[PDB]
Amino acid sequence: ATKAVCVLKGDGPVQGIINFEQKESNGPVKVWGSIKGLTEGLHGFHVHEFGDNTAGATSAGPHFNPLSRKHGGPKDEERHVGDLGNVTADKDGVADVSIEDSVISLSGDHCIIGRTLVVHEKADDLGKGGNEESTKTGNAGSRLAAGVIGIAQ
Amino acid sequence: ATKAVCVLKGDGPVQGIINFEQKESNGPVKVWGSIKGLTEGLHGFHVHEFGDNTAGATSAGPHFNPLSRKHGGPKDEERHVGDLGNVTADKDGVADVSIEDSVISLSGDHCIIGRTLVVHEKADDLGKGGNEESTKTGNAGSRLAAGVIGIAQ
Ligand SMILES: [Zn+2]
Ligand SMILES: [Zn+2]
C-alpha cells in the first residue's frame, strides 16, 4: 500500500492533518483526518497543481487538472483531478474528513504527492454556480489552510 | 524542465527557500536558494525519506536511502541518495546554497519530490567520524528546519 500525509496550515486558526492511503496502484485512494478552526458548514477541498508554498497557499496555482477539464464535484465526469468537493465542519468548527476517490492517485499520471491540498473559506459550488469562476474554482473563496502532500511511512 | 521547491521552517530561527531544477531526467539536479537564521559554519543538509511533517522534522524518518547504503558525502559512491553534504552559513547566518548532484532526481526511483529536506544543527562528518552514528546520520545533530519538497511551475 502507498501512504501519504498533509499538514494543513495557514495565517488564521484553521489547521489539520489529512492522511491518504491507496492499497493498489489501480485502486481508490482513501483520504481521512481532521481540520479544526473552521466556520460551521461546507468548505472547498482541493488538490492544487503545485507544491509551492513560497507565497503561502497562493503559489499552489490552480486545481490539479492534467486532463484539461472544467471544474466540478468529485462524483462528476467533468471534473479536475483535484476536485474533492466539500468537507463539512460541525458546530465546534471541526471537519472530520472521510472520502474515497478513484480519480486521484498516489502514483503515476494522476499522482498528487508533491502537490498542495487546500481547504477554502466557503462552499465549492461543484461547477453549478453559473459564472466563469464556477468552472475554474467553484467559488470557494480564499485559501484558509494548505500543505504539501508528502510520502508517509 | 522539471522543477521543485521547498520552504524550510522549524521551531527556531532557521528559514529558507530551496529550489531544485533538473533539465533532463538522466541528468544532474541543481539545488539552490537562501537559508537564514543559521549559526556561522557548516550544517548537514539531507533529504529524508518521508514527507511527514506531523511531528516537525522528527517525523521525516531517516535519510532517503533506497539502495540500503551507509551514510557518506555527496562525492562518495557509498552514500545515501539523500546525502547532500554540508551547506555553509556566513557570518550573518546566511547559507547561499548552490549544489549540483547526480544521485538525487526529480523523477524515477531516486525521486525526492514528496520527501523532506532537512538542515541540521552542525557539520555532517560525511561518514568519517569512526562511530556507528557517523555511518547513519553523519553526527549532524538536531534537525533545525525542514520542509516537504513540492512540484514547482
Ligand atoms: Zn476544480
Ligand atoms: Zn545519510
Numbering used by the authors:
A (entry chain A), B (entry chain F): 1 to 153
List passages from the publication reporting this PDB structure.
Superoxide dismutase-1 (SOD1) is one of the most abundant human proteins and is an important part of our antioxidant, redox signalling and respiratory control mechanisms. Here, we discover the mechanisms that govern SOD1 maturation and stabilisation through interaction with the chaperone protein hCCS. Combinations of mutants yielded crystallographic structures of full-length hCCS in two different conformers complexed with hSOD1; an hCCS domain II truncation complexed with hSOD1; an hCCS domain II homodimer structure at higher resolution than previously available (1.55 Å); and the hSOD1 disulphide knock-out mutant used to promote complexation.
We recently predicted hSOD1 disulphide sub-loop (amino acids His48–His63) movement on complexation with hCCS based on small-angle x-ray scattering (SAXS) data. This is proven true by our new structures, where it adopts a conformation that could not be accommodated if the hSOD1 disulphide were present. In illustration of this point, a recent nuclear magnetic resonance (NMR) characterisation indicated SOD1 amino acids 49–54 are disordered in the zinc-metalated, disulphide-reduced state.
